[PDB]
Design a protein around this ligand. Structure first.
Ligand SMILES: CN(C)c1ccc(C(=O)NCCCCCCC(=O)NO)cc1
Ligand SMILES: [K+]
Ligand SMILES: [K+]
Ligand SMILES: [Zn+2]
Length: 354
C-alpha cells in the first residue's frame, strides 16, 4: 500500500508544453523530487488512452474531429484553440488517469496520483474551459469496473460541470463540487439548487462559495458536507480533483486558501481508507501550485518537510521568501455565515433523500 505516482519524463515533457500552464508539470515534479518524495512512492509510467477507452465517454464524432484538427470549418460546433498535437496531449493525460484508476483496481495501491490530470470541464462532444478530454470522467468509468459507487470530490475554484454532466442521471456516481459561484463567473453553473436529473436527482452536490474564503471556514464547510455525504452515499472509491486556483497568489484572485486548508480536506478523505484517485486541475501561479501539490503529496505520505525550498531547477521562481508556505492575502472574506449555513441546510435536505 505504497502510493502510485503517475510519472514519466516523456509525460511531464508532453504536459509542460500545455499552452496555458507552461512548465507546470516539470515545476511540480521537480519540486516533488527535490524533496525526494518520489522515493516513497511506486512510480508507474502512464499508458496513452486508447481510442476505445476515450470513446467510453466522448463521442466518436468528437474524437474524430479533435484528432483531425490536431494534425477550420466544423470546429465551432465542438468548441475549438486547435493546436498541432492537441489530440496526443489529451490522450496522454487521459491514459495517465486511466493508468492510475487501473492500479487501484488491481489492488496495487490504495492511493494513485496523476497531478497533471483534472480537466473537469470537457463534455462528451464539446471542449470547454481549456479541456479537450475529460480524464476525470474517464478515470471514474474505469473505476466502475470494480467499484459500484464512486464519490467524486472537486475542490477546484471552478465548478466541475463536465464530470457532473456525465453522471447527472445516475446514482452510481455522486459528484461533489466546492467552487466559486457568482453571476458572470465561469462556468456559471453549480448552484446549490443543481442536484441532477431523473434517477440521478440528489446525487449532484454543489457548494457555491464567494470570494475571500480562507482555510478554517473552507474546511468546516468541506467536512460538514463530506461527513453527511459519506453516511448517505457510502462510496467504495473516491476521485479527488485538487486544482490549485483557490490558493492565495493565484491570478484568479478569488479564494484565499493555503495548501494546509486543502490538505486538511484531503486528510479527512484519506481517513475513509477507500481507493482514492488524486488529480490536479487549475493553478495559474506556477510555483504556488508546485508548493500546493508538493505539500498535498507529503500529506498523502504522512512525511514532514522543511520550509526552505530545496535548491533545484526552478528555485528562482519561488520568490520572495523561498519557502514552501503560502501566506493569505489581506482581502475580505465575502461569505455571509448565514448564506453558508442555508446552503449546508439545503444540502442536508437533499442528502436525506439518498
Ligand atoms: C488573461 N486572459 C487572456 C484570460 C484570463 C482568464 C480567462 C478565463 O477565466 N476564461 C474563462 C475560462 C476559465 C477556465 C479556467 C480553467 C479552470 O481552472 N477550470 O477549473 C480567459 C483569459
Ligand atoms: K470545484
Ligand atoms: K450523479
Ligand atoms: Zn479551475
Amino acid at each position: 500500500l505504497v502510493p502510485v505516482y503517475i510519472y514519466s519524463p516523456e509525460y511531464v515533457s508532453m504536459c509542460d508544453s500545455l499552452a496555458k500552464i507552461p512548465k507546470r508539470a516539470s515545476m511540480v515534479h521537480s519540486l516533488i523530487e527535490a524533496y525526494a518524495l518520489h522515493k516513497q512512492m511506486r512510480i508507474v509510467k502512464p499508458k496513452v488512452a486508447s481510442m476505445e477507452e476515450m470513446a467510453t465517454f466522448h463521442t466518436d464524432a468528437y474524437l474524430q474531429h479533435l484528432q483531425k484538427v490536431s494534425q477550420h470549418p466544423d470546429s465551432i460546433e465542438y468548441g475549438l484553440p486547435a493546436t498541432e498535437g492537441i489530440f496526443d496531449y489529451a490522450a496522454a493525460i487521459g491514459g495517465a488517469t486511466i493508468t492510475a484508476a487501473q492500479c487501484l483496481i488491481d489492488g496495487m495501491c490504495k492511493v494513485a496520483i496523476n497531478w497533471s490530470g483534472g480537466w473537469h470541464h470537457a463534455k462528451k462532444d464539446e471542449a470547454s474551459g481549456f479541456c479537450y478530454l475529460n480524464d476525470a470522467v474517464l478515470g471514474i468509468l474505469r473505476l466502475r469496473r470494480k467499484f459500484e459507487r464512486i464519490l467524486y470530490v472537486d475542490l477546484d475554484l471552478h465548478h466541475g460541470d463536465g464530470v457532473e454532466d456525465a453522471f447527472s442521471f445516475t446514482s452510481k456516481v455522486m459528484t461533489v463540487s466546492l467552487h466559486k459561484f457568482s453571476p458572470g463567473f465561469f462556468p456559471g453553473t453549480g448552484d446549490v439548487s443543481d442536484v441532477g436529473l431523473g434517477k440521478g436527482r440528489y446525487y449532484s452536490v454543489n457548494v457555491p462559495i464567494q470570494d475571500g474564503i480562507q482555510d478554517e471556514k473552507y474546511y468546516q464547510i468541506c467536512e460538514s458536507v463530506l461527513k453527511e455525504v459519506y453516511q448517505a452515499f457510502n462510496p467504495k472509491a473516491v476521485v479527488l480533483q485538487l486544482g490549485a486556483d483557490t490558493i492565495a497568489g493565484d491570478p484568479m484572485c478569488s479564494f484565499n486558501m493555503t495548501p494546509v486548508g486543502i490538505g486538511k480536506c484531503l486528510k479527512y478523505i484519506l481517513q475513509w481508507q477507500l481507493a482514492t484517485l488524486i488529480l490536479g486541475g487549475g493553478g495559474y501561479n506556477l510555483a504556488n501550485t508546485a508548493r500546493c501539490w508538493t505539500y498535498l503529496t507529503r500529506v498523502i505520505l504522512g512525511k514532514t518537510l522543511s520550509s526552505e525550498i530545496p535548491d533545484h531547477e526552478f528555485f528562482t521562481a519561488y520568490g520572495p521568501d523561498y519557502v514552501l508556505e503560502i501566506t493569505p492575502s489581506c482581502r475580505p472574506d465575502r461569505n455571509e455565515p448565514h448564506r453558508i449555513q442555508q446552503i449546508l441546510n439545503y444540502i442536508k435536505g437533499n442528502l436525506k433523500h439518498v
